[PDB]
From a paper:
In the Siphoviridae SPP1 phage, the tail tube consists of the TTPs gp17.1 and gp17.1* in a ratio of 3:1, with the latter being generated by a translational frameshift adding a fibronectin type III (FN3) domain to the C-terminus of the protein. The α-helices are arranged almost parallel to the tail tube axis.
Torsion angles were predicted based on assigned backbone chemical shifts. Hence, these samples deliver a set of restraints that defines the relative organization of gp17.1 subunits within the tube. During structure calculation only the structure of a single monomer was represented and refined. The structures of the other subunits were generated by applying symmetry operators to the subunit structure. We represented two stacked rings in the structure calculation.
Numbering used by the authors:
A (entry chain D), B (entry chain E), C (entry chain F), D (entry chain A), E (entry chain L), F (entry chain B), ...: 5 to 176
Write the structure that this text describes.
Amino acid sequence: PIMGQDVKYLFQSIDAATGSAPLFPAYQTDGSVSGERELFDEQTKNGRILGPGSVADSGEVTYYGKRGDAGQKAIEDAYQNGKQIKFWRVDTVKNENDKYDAQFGFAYIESREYSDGVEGAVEISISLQVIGELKNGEIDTLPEEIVNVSKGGYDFQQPGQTTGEAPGTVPA
Amino acid sequence: PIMGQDVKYLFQSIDAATGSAPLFPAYQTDGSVSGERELFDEQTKNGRILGPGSVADSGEVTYYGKRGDAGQKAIEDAYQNGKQIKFWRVDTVKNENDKYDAQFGFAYIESREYSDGVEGAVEISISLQVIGELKNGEIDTLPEEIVNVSKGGYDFQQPGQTTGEAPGTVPA
Amino acid sequence: PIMGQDVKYLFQSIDAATGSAPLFPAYQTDGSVSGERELFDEQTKNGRILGPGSVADSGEVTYYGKRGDAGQKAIEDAYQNGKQIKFWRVDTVKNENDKYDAQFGFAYIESREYSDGVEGAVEISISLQVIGELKNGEIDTLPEEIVNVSKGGYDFQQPGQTTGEAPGTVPA
Amino acid sequence: PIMGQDVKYLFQSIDAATGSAPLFPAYQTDGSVSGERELFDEQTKNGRILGPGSVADSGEVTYYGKRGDAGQKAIEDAYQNGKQIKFWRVDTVKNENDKYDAQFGFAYIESREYSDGVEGAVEISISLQVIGELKNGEIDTLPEEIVNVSKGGYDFQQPGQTTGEAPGTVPA
Amino acid sequence: PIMGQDVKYLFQSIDAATGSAPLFPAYQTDGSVSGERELFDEQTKNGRILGPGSVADSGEVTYYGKRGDAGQKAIEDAYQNGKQIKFWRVDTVKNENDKYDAQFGFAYIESREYSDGVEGAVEISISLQVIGELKNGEIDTLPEEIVNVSKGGYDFQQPGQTTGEAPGTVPA
Amino acid sequence: PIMGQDVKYLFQSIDAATGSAPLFPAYQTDGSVSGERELFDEQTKNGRILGPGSVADSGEVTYYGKRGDAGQKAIEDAYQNGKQIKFWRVDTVKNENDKYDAQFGFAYIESREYSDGVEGAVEISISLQVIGELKNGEIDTLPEEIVNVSKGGYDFQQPGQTTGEAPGTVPA
Amino acid sequence: PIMGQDVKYLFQSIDAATGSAPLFPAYQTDGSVSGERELFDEQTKNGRILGPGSVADSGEVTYYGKRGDAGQKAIEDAYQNGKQIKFWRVDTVKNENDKYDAQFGFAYIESREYSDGVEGAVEISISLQVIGELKNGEIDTLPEEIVNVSKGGYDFQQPGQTTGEAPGTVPA
Amino acid sequence: PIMGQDVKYLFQSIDAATGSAPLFPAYQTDGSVSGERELFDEQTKNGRILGPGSVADSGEVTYYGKRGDAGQKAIEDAYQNGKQIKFWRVDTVKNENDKYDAQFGFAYIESREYSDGVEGAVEISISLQVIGELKNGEIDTLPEEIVNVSKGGYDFQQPGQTTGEAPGTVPA
Amino acid sequence: PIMGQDVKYLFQSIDAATGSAPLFPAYQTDGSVSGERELFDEQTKNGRILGPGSVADSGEVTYYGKRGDAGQKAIEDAYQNGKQIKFWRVDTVKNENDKYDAQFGFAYIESREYSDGVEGAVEISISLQVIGELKNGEIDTLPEEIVNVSKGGYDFQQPGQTTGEAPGTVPA
Amino acid sequence: PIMGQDVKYLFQSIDAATGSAPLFPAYQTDGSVSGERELFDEQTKNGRILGPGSVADSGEVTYYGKRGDAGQKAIEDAYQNGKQIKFWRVDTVKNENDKYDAQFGFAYIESREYSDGVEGAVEISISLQVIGELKNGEIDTLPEEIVNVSKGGYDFQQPGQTTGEAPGTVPA
Amino acid sequence: PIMGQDVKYLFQSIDAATGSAPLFPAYQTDGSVSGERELFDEQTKNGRILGPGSVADSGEVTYYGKRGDAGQKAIEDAYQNGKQIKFWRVDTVKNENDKYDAQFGFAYIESREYSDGVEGAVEISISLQVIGELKNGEIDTLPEEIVNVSKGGYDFQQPGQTTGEAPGTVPA
């Protein structure tokens, strides 16, 4: 079925007006929760509790913050400046009659949480409501991230290419 | 008694008007909860708390979402378009004076939950109320699924039948 | 003292009008809870919080449902048709000046819960209120169940008595 | 200090009018909880939250019920008939200027709970309020129980004294 | 006392409905383990840890698999088709008031293990639980195996009776 | 830093009028909780939620009760007679410009809890509010307890000094 | 990304008027929680739940208290005298176009918690609200602490430099 | 019975789409382990622990890796590229109504282990789970390996056929 | 250094009140284990894992039980009656400024183990905790045992001194 | 196949930025362990336990430490300074379309172990995790070590070339 | 490489304030174990399991205790009084640009173990944690022990120099 790595979530800010949506690395986990409100109280009749109602749609996003990357800075301007961000969640498996497959919306920063612990690494919990996320097919592959997600491995670096802790440095 | 695999749940959408009910693969677990409201307050009399009342009937359904299958797309049109779905829960053990045995109702999408984690695979929690599920015998076997639930095993494929990750491919 | 297997619970339906109470196999566990309401608020006086009040008596019953047996079908007509059932809880140890020893009442189906999981077997949680359970001695032994509860073991079946998964089959 | 076996609790019923208090075997554990209500709201003054108030005194008692013993039947008439019971909690260690040491009160049966499980043995949770338990020295040793609590061991029974599951039978 | 060769174990399948139980050659060793669950926790009382409880009865069977013989094919349909098998363990020494002496039950295939090594020969470890094995006297001698277990030795074959690796061939 | 054994808590009763504060042995653990109430509701202004307010100061004390010792009897007269007790919490590490270092207050017995279990030993949970605990330096060392806390070990007792379970008896 | 040791938190008191902010050793963990309040109730319209609102910003700080150090004494005057403290949280990794990187605010002592246990060492939980923490770059390195955080190790001390439990003593 | 050399294991990759399954030389040993999950907890009833359940089927494979051969390169693409491999285990003894006899499945690379020691030769431990291995008859003899397994011996090479360490070289 | 025979262990019971400590013959071996609990979790600071803590001190004693000797009967009253015993472990080599050298404590009988085997002789494993064993110099030589430990050899007995299996009998 | 001496492991440090990877002499043995995480729980479906997952890749390295050589000093700066090291494992047998054949990665020092014993020589156990080792062909022969591994033997030294314990000294 | 006798371990106590570190004779063996904690959970990303973490550094020391020598008495005051000891481990082979080569730290007595057996001689197992051992060059040779470790042999003593069991006595 769909794998845990398969569904990934990208956001595009409204004010940027750019042709691309930053997504942030080191994801922890993603809960999108969607409540469809229903009829109150049957009155012991013919079923007055199976009726239509409004939908309350909210999601939370947890990840580990990196020192300085752009979806996080998008989140930072999102919460700290106070803007809504465009919300995209797509699947990495290629769509057979589209680029990718997505669910889309406009979202807000309901709350943000920052944990610093003595073990592990900094963890951000960001919670958001949305006014109705809709499903569609994803057009922008953005093959740097969704298409290409590598383990950092590269074939050799044996003459010494000025390397460091990162998974491939070059000489100067 | 009845096994955990024995009771399986199929839904048929109202708008489809088809002669068959899609059920979805990769089930996690099924809670159907049925509350029969009773008399308030004995008044220290002869028993004024054992009296009849209305019934609140609600169930939740958890499963792992597959990339694109029809009960899930039935769920997707169920929640996202906003429709009630016909609710069938039957037992795989053959009925001796019926095809199968069932409990049936008309149900609504009270809430849906979608979890994406770094481990495991995508998990959907869908919660629904119903206006009174009733018990009957199941007429439609649908022997593709209830009758036939295989492990994917097949006897050999040894001359090379263009195989893949799926449990039986054929040449082209 | 009294063992976990020692206290067993039988129900007799009101409408049946039969000389025997069906009890259901594969019990999980039984909670009977009895609240005796007391005086409110001493007023820092001589003890105005040790005073008499009404009693709220409710119990829940958990068990694993078998495909088709009669106490369960008694439960099924109990909840699904909407009837109160006569409530008997007796002890398997023989009473020395009675057949058995019991607590008795008339009970209602406040709620029923049905769990289907991928592991294990179907589990029913049924919750009920009662209007005052009373203690007495149990007259009906019903020696098929209370008196006789066997492990299914039988001495031999060695010439082949057309056996199956059940603990004793006979030839045809 | 005081051991877990050291503090034991006996009750004497009001209506019995006997010169002895039944305590029940197979104790699980005993919580006596005593709340001394205090002044509301300092008003940021000189301390208007350290002031005297009434006391709410309640305790719960858990034990494993034996088939038929008298403190349990005292509990049974306590709850089921609806009476208050005199409450004694004493220490097994001998008092140096009294028989024993006790805390005493008059208590009521606020609630009773009966659990039957498939494992283990029947367990009773009984909850009670009291109108002020007071501390004193215990006069009645009742040396059958507090003074004498044996493991059931006896030196030999080797010529055969018609024995059973109990820790000492005699011939007929 | 009873020898290592003395106690041998035969199984009869439920579905066969035959008048005889296949046992398999080349036994390695047989562990039958039977746990009688007891009372929890004395509470430092009169002995609340010597009390009765349920019994967990499980056994494992190790043997060396032969290319094609019927108890193994009984095991193979046992595990691979998924059936319970009737369980017989009898003693080779003749019973003085019965044919043989046995312990009997109905058993299931909890697990099977197959080892192929470069040394030695294929070894099967099969583990099973049972719902209560009972002791009785064995009625069916089956004198081909229990009564008769020969070393393969035969007096002569000197004119040439078309012999092979097996312990007695005949001419064609 | 400060160790778990380092901070110890002594109480002095108001009515005693003695030159010394009893502290009780066999401490379990000490929670002192101090809430400083703040401004409600910024009104999205310049910060109307960072404003000063009153302080709610409460602590709970858990320990294992000894048969008869004086801080416990101080607690007993504290709760059961109904008095406030003077509250001292000091550190065992010697102060360099004082005897010891302390936090001090006047405290009340908001609630007391007594647990008797079948395992372990009697445990008292006592909860108290205070009208503002203040920090100071501790003047009274009380070197019997804070200064001197021994394991009970003594060099020898080899000619027999009429010993018992306690860590040093003498002859008569 | 950012490590658990990487983000550290310093406070500067308002009244001190000094050119440096004390931070306290032996940190346990730091939760900063920031709630951005949003529009109530869509009314099933065009999205009236994605709207702007106020922000509730609160954090809690846990650490192990040392006998006498200045951020703790800053905390002590913070809570016990009743002052707001200036709030700085910076990252240890050097900023490439600033000294360091920080988030800054003015904060208050909403609550303080002090735990003394028999195991481990004294633990302080301090909770605070803030009226809007803002992100900036950190100017003051304070290289004693952020820049320099050593394990206490030093190369040798072999002629005897009057040493103690601390990680480097000198002769007198 | 079946010998240690008798049962040999071949794998065929899914993506290859070839009419033949590579098996790897220098086998160490093969464990195939198959767990058939059973009913939990009898409840001291009629046997609620002899019931059907799912099957967990896993095997491990140990061998000594050769410099470059195709089943190992099949294993290498299996683990390192991340593919499932078709799993065949057949017996070398000729089947009397089939080519050979087999057990078959689709298998995955759960783990791989590579040991390099100073003694002996490189040893690979590869562990795999399977979703249900089934038994059948083996159709492909592959007489190069199963049918023909020689010691490397050849009758003579006495005029000098440009020989080396391998068991038969030819001139150039 | 210190030999295996050099360190020997004597116990003195508390209740005896005698001027001498029985030690038991036929020692097997003695483990005294002493755990000094330390600081949890550095927090990657300056070393918060090198800190002081409590000490858990426990030892086990193995020996071969003799039919009736007094340290064993001291052990027997120790465990079976339930008393703590005074614990002495001294060295046989003479102290140069004391009689002997010792480590001393008060000890309890945490567990006792008795093995009877078909080979060898009865073996007792007794395990004990202690509340802090301290080191000192041993005052009581007890020269019968520590000072004098002979092989049982005596110069002659040649006129016949009514001898037996023991290493020196006398006439009657 | 591949010999125990055939596969050897070289590391190159990231910070060095040199055109060569130090490997360390006196290898003991090398375990590289690679776990490919799989799907949880079939749910008794079509095989939901044969699914893809992440890979946990870790290895341990044991060797005997030499007084001062550069891979060990690379290890020493690796662990003691705290750096990741580039990980190369190649085979000594010449590749036919490459220099050598390798598996490569970036690795970290998860743990180091140093044993000093009275027998034998110092032994270092170093354990490391890796984020995905990949297989390739080895480009750098480094013919000093991999290509050339001599026993220390040299043809003669008979006029006296100022020799010592080492396998070839020269005059001064 | 480095021999088993080559690396020896000396300790210097903090409180002594002396210009020399006692090491203890009759070493058994020395394990120093150093764990460098790493990143949790890659999240199937670019390698989030190769990240930096804290280091847990602990060692154990086994030796045979001598009747009275100073490192042992240093150990004895170490554990029994409760002090940390300065930790030095150096190599006996002369450093070419230092006196010797060392690894150094401050260490604590986590646990001590004392075994007395009937065979052999007293054996002490002492276990310790450390807050980060660092490597350096050893300055103090202490040529009595490291430089000079003799077998006890001396050329002659033939006129009788009042000798004993020790390897050289003199006349009186």
